[PDB]
């Protein structure tokens, strides 16, 4: 069997039909893929809707006896049941192009990808990464492409890549669980490819809670970030490349995650919890890596590593206001001292 399409469900009755219709409309043999649905203890009619496709799809259904607290555990249960040569993770409120499995099977057959990124499209307002999907590419790397800016699991992965290297989702975690999973898959794959010939993965914005907006404590969130830093630094790769991958991950994280601006947005009285958790993550990053990140991040790494919220916050407010304690302009960039007696940080733009 070529593919296992893995679908975690949770009270998905209002939309799960759109996904299952897109799976049944695949212009790809139904004998060559299976749909592995693991229901995270829904209380609605999700499962009765899924069972209407039993004779239409190669279908595997099971249900956890209690809600696991996120997508991770149902996808892990499904991954173990999966028999396809490759897996594709699709969320219950999304759907896929009818040529997706055909196009991906044809592309994998020629290029032997271990991880295949497939171009996504936002539906009614949903934002989706696009910077890595401007071109189809048989071979890309963590350092010569923007794949690190997309860590969602809505990609195709060789099943043996995941299982031979023991790559699973963290469980009982509302969100960011995918970042470690996909970074592990990136770090272990012999070849990563990008298929951009059409819109393959449609990501919707329905309502009710979306996981990636549910509460996760700073402690749980930044533990996944620390594990990622540990994972990179332990990969079987040359030392300089590992540092460079960690730096790129840090550029992404400080630009796009909840870390960005947290000292401006989080209630003052909650910020010591944030800097203690963020600092535990930055303390796993060797200081030599700071020289490789975007220069504007170097003071944030500095004060995070010292768990110094007052100076971290001064940096963020200085950026936001454009008011600095002292600074020089050298080569069109800023050399900034953010507070009396503190270091100057150079090259900021
Ligand atoms: C970036 C992207 O394109 N999609 C990700 C985004 O989607 P998103 O924020 O939309 O998260 P969702 O609410 O759709 O949950 C994702 C999937 O997990 C299932 N679910 C949800 C709650 C639960 O307790 N048990 C359960 O199985 C949903 O039915 C759904 O199939 O944030 C999630 C949390 O990191 C990721 O896993 C999604 O893949």
Residue numbers in the entry: 1 to 349
Task: Give passages from the manuscript.
In this article we describe the crystal structure of TarS, an enzyme responsible for the glycosylation of wall teichoic acid polymers of the S. aureus cell wall, a process that has been shown to be specifically responsible for methicillin resistance in MRSA. TarS possesses a catalytic domain with a canonical GTA fold (one of two distinct A/B folds characteristic of nucleotide-sugar dependent glycosyltransferases) consisting of two closely associated α/β/α sandwich Rossmann motifs that abut and form a continuous central β-sheet. TarS possesses a D(91)XDD motif with aspartates coordinating a metal cation, a feature that is typical of the GTA superfamily. Altogether, TarS features a novel architecture with closely-associated trimerization domains connected by a linker region to three protruding catalytic domains that face away from each other.
